[PDB]
Scaffold this active site. Structure first.
Site, short mmCIF file in Angstrom:
data_model
loop_
_atom_site.label_atom_id
_atom_site.label_comp_id
_atom_site.label_asym_id
_atom_site.label_seq_id
_atom_site.Cartn_x
_atom_site.Cartn_y
_atom_site.Cartn_z
N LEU A 31 0.83 -1.20 0.00
CA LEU A 31 0.00 0.00 0.00
C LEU A 31 0.87 1.26 0.00
O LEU A 31 0.35 2.37 -0.12
CB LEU A 31 -0.94 0.05 1.21
CG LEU A 31 -1.99 -1.04 1.34
CD1 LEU A 31 -2.56 -1.10 2.72
CD2 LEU A 31 -3.09 -0.80 0.31
N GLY A 32 2.18 1.09 0.14
CA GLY A 32 3.06 2.22 0.41
C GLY A 32 4.42 1.75 0.87
O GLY A 32 4.53 0.83 1.69
N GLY A 72 8.62 3.55 1.40
CA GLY A 72 9.20 4.84 1.81
C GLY A 72 10.54 4.55 2.43
O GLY A 72 11.04 3.47 2.25
N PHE A 95 10.35 4.93 5.54
CA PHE A 95 9.67 4.55 6.78
C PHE A 95 9.48 3.04 6.88
O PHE A 95 8.75 2.54 7.75
CB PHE A 95 8.32 5.28 6.92
CG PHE A 95 7.38 5.07 5.77
CD1 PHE A 95 6.66 3.87 5.63
CD2 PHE A 95 7.16 6.09 4.84
CE1 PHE A 95 5.77 3.68 4.57
CE2 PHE A 95 6.25 5.90 3.76
CZ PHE A 95 5.56 4.71 3.63
N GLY A 96 10.13 2.30 5.99
CA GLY A 96 9.76 0.92 5.84
C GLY A 96 8.68 0.86 4.78
O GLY A 96 8.70 1.64 3.82
N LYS A 124 2.43 -2.04 9.04
CA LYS A 124 3.69 -1.36 8.77
C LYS A 124 4.83 -2.18 9.34
O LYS A 124 4.71 -2.75 10.43
CB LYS A 124 3.72 0.07 9.32
CG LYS A 124 5.05 0.90 8.96
CD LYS A 124 4.87 2.33 9.53
CE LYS A 124 6.05 3.17 9.12
NZ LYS A 124 5.85 4.64 9.33
N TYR A 127 -7.25 0.01 8.04
CA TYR A 127 -7.02 0.17 6.61
C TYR A 127 -8.00 1.22 6.01
O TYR A 127 -9.19 1.23 6.35
CB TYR A 127 -7.17 -1.19 5.96
CG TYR A 127 -7.33 -1.22 4.45
CD1 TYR A 127 -6.34 -0.72 3.62
CD2 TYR A 127 -8.45 -1.83 3.85
CE1 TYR A 127 -6.46 -0.76 2.24
CE2 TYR A 127 -8.56 -1.91 2.45
CZ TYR A 127 -7.57 -1.37 1.67
OH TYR A 127 -7.63 -1.42 0.29
N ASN A 141 -5.52 8.51 -0.07
CA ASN A 141 -5.35 9.74 0.65
C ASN A 141 -6.39 10.75 0.19
O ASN A 141 -7.02 10.58 -0.86
CB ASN A 141 -3.88 10.24 0.59
CG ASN A 141 -3.48 10.85 -0.77
OD1 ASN A 141 -4.14 11.75 -1.32
ND2 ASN A 141 -2.38 10.40 -1.28
N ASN A 180 -1.67 13.26 3.95
CA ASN A 180 -1.58 12.51 5.18
C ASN A 180 -2.91 12.30 5.88
O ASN A 180 -2.97 11.98 7.08
CB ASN A 180 -0.53 13.16 6.13
CG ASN A 180 0.90 12.93 5.65
OD1 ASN A 180 1.22 11.88 5.06
ND2 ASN A 180 1.75 13.91 5.87
N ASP A 213 0.16 8.94 10.03
CA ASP A 213 1.53 9.43 10.25
C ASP A 213 1.64 10.49 11.36
O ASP A 213 2.47 11.37 11.30
CB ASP A 213 2.11 10.04 8.97
CG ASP A 213 2.64 9.00 7.95
OD1 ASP A 213 2.53 7.77 8.16
OD2 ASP A 213 3.16 9.47 6.89
N1 LIG Z 1 -4.48 2.53 2.35
C1 LIG Z 1 -3.96 2.64 3.60
N2 LIG Z 1 -4.67 2.35 4.72
C2 LIG Z 1 -4.14 2.49 5.93
C3 LIG Z 1 -2.84 2.95 6.04
C4 LIG Z 1 -2.13 3.25 4.88
N3 LIG Z 1 -2.70 3.08 3.68
C5 LIG Z 1 -0.75 3.78 4.94
C6 LIG Z 1 0.04 3.79 3.79
C7 LIG Z 1 1.35 4.29 3.83
C8 LIG Z 1 1.84 4.80 5.04
C9 LIG Z 1 1.02 4.80 6.17
C10 LIG Z 1 -0.27 4.29 6.15
C11 LIG Z 1 -1.15 4.30 7.36
C12 LIG Z 1 -0.47 4.30 8.67
C13 LIG Z 1 -0.82 5.31 9.59
C14 LIG Z 1 -0.25 5.39 10.87
C15 LIG Z 1 0.67 4.36 11.19
C16 LIG Z 1 1.02 3.34 10.28
C17 LIG Z 1 0.46 3.29 9.02
C18 LIG Z 1 -2.19 3.14 7.37
#
Ligand SMILES: Nc1ncc2c(n1)-c1ccccc1[C@H](c1ccccc1)C2
Length: 275
Positions: free
Chosen positions: A24-25, A27, A29-30, A50, A99, A104, A148, A161
């Site tokens: 999903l992402g 960085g 940040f991991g 994460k 989730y 965003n 964010n 975040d």
């Molecule tokens: N589609 C999606 N749903 C939920 C999150 C992320 N992406 C996401 C995608 C990339 C980065 C972060 C996040 C979020 C996050 C927030 C706070 C702590 C850990 C993870 C959680």
């Protein structure tokens, strides 16, 4: 923690109860992946996870831990991404959170250029609410921007975040984060709840331009120059003077003259009811 993490039974989920899925992402940040969590009783939940990436260091581990630990302390709120669980034992750290299937807020607004005027003020109110809660927990976000804010399946705004542990660096969508930073933060490096309030102002502008780009084409040096001149973004088309005065109030050069998130929430709640 390089050998073993401290235990916390209240949050621990058995690894056999979690099935990791698609990215999903990424960085520095991991990385975050979609996952399916069994019984956070035999209930299956889509969650985001994460974790470190394979080149992470011992300091990256301790940043991930401190973000998990900050989310524990901050506690639950409908308009923040909440901590649901963790795998901390016998294997890589997994921080398991809510989730958001709709991406965003920038992406959400851009795909919908469908939202009513009420919907838009509602997005602003949900975000102010999340921020009011965080501020009440002493959390200063430091990069509040539509990028964010994440949106769920049922259209709930959730700040992401906020538990996190270079003026020239661009985001994934090639925009410069300094365009959201209060002048006291950027120049004097003073970060408060009120510098987050300035960022909320830019985020309001993002909302009422349906995911527009602040200061398009302006590099870091020229932005400094604009802030120094007391420049302020033009009122977007389709935006009542009252919502624009709210942005402009968030952009007051003097922080104590900006509204608070608590005043922002009271005003937005009132504005939504009348829109
Ligand atoms: N589609 C999606 N749903 C939920 C999150 C992320 N992406 C996401 C995608 C990339 C980065 C972060 C996040 C979020 C996050 C927030 C706070 C702590 C850990 C993870 C959680």
């Amino acid at each position: 923690s390089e050998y073993e993490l401290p235990e916390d039974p209240r949050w621990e989920l058995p690894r056999d109860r979690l099935v990791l899925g698609k990215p999903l992402g990424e960085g520095a940040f991991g990385q975050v992946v979609l996952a399916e969590a069994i019984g956070l009783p035999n209930r299956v939940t889509k969650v985001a996870v994460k974790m470190l990436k394979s080149d992470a260091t011992e300091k990256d581990l301790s940043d991930l831990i401190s973000e998990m630990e900050m989310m524990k302390m901050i506690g639950k709120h409908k308009n923040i991404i909440n901590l649901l669980g963790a795998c901390t034992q016998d294997g890589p750290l997994y921080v398991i959170v809510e989730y958001a299937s709709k991406g965003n807020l920038r992406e959400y607004l851009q795909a919908r250029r469908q939202l009513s005027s009420k919907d838009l003020v509602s997005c602003a109110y949900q975000v102010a609410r999340g921020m009011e809660y965080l501020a009440s927990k002493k959390c200063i976000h430091r990069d509040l921007a539509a990028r964010n804010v994440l949106v769920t399946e049922d259209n709930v705004m959730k700040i992401a975040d906020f538990g996190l542990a270079d003026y020239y660096k661009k985001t994934t969508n090639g925009r410069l984060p300094v365009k959201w930073m209060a002048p006291e933060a950027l120049f004097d490096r003073i970060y408060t709840h009120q510098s987050d309030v300035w960022s909320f102002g830019v985020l309001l502008w993002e909302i009422f331009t349906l995911g527009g780009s602040p200061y398009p084409g302006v590099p870091v040096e020229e932005l400094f120059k604009l802030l120094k001149e007391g420049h302020r973004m033009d009122k977007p088309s389709n935006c009542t003077n009252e919502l624009y005065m709210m942005m402009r109030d968030c952009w007051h050069a003097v922080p104590s003259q900006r509204p608070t998130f608590k005043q922002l929430v009271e005003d937005l709640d009132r504005i939504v009811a009348l829109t």
